[PDB]
Amino acid sequence: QQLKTKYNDQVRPALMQQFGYSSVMAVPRIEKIVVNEGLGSSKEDSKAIDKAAKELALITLQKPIITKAKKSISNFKLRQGMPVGIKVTLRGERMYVFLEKLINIGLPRIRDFRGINPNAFDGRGNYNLGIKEQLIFPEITYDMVDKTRGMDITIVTTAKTDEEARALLQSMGLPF
RNA sequence: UAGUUUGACUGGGGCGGUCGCCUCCCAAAAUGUAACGGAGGCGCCCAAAGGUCACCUCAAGACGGUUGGAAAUCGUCUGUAG
Ligand SMILES: [Mg+2]
Ligand SMILES: [Mg+2]
Ligand SMILES: [Mg+2]
């Protein structure tokens, strides 16, 4: 908790020194961290989908919500109004913890050349994150969770400039 | 054996089709207006698809992304409505 706030307060002068803003509020900040499970790659019965909501909830200390299918009957087993993937917003203390879970000791570090190769491009916030697999926890035991879905995790931050995206990882404990 | 019934429109009768209600064009910028003229629906539904109170905003595109990738799902930008 206090460590994430200290890294925020160390980043903000670091950005005012690499790029002076008139205001600390002009500095980039991190708004929310979202994690989107998408069990439409493995649509199931209530059993498996509630189990995946169960595992994200155990990871989060939050209740995940189900995103529900849009009107879009299609070739690909698509229907009308049915679940098609969990979603979890995080703001406040529940958010920063996860990032401090990920920057520091709670990182699985199961695989890492560097950080995921940069994707925001335009440099305003939206830093999308792909976890190809969830063999990345001590929360699971692999023989029982022999299924391994992936995860999407989008970082949302203010940033009116492209290069300023470099601030949200380099000084934020993320490899670049 | 007996008393009867056996529909109409119909560019002649028959055959085919049609017979009630709703929508559009025809319909000539009022209302109305024919055709066996051009198109298509209804003979139901909903214990909530009502009353009320309160709250949300939709398509679609592009950039980015986990088993998905032309289109699952999340994320930003545009977005009097497509
Ligand atoms: Mg006659
Ligand atoms: Mg008239
Ligand atoms: Mg007349």
Method of determination used here: X-ray
| Sheet with A127-131: strands ordered across | A65-68, A83-90, A30-36, A151-157, A127-131
Residue ranges of domains in chain A = 1-176
* CA atom of A171 to C1′ atom of B26, Å: 74
**CB count in 10 Å sphere of residue A93:** 10
Q: Which residues pair with A34 in a beta bridge?
A: A89, A154
Cβ pair A66, A36 in contact under 8 A: no
Q: Among A38, A61, A34, A32, which Cα is nearest to A150's?
A: A38
Q: Identify nearest nucleotide to residue A133 by CA to C1′ distance.
A: B66
- DSSP labels, A2-37: HHHHHHHHHHHHHHHHHS--SSTTTS--EEEEEEE-
Give the three-state DSSP class for A88. Answer: strand
A12 contacts: CB under 8 Å, gap ≥ 6: A24, A27
* Resolution as reported, in Å: 3.4
Contact call for residues A154 and A30 (beta carbons, < 8 A): no
> How many C-beta atoms surround the C-beta of residue A159 within 10 A?
22
Contact between A165 and A127 under an 8 Å Cβ cutoff? The reply is yes
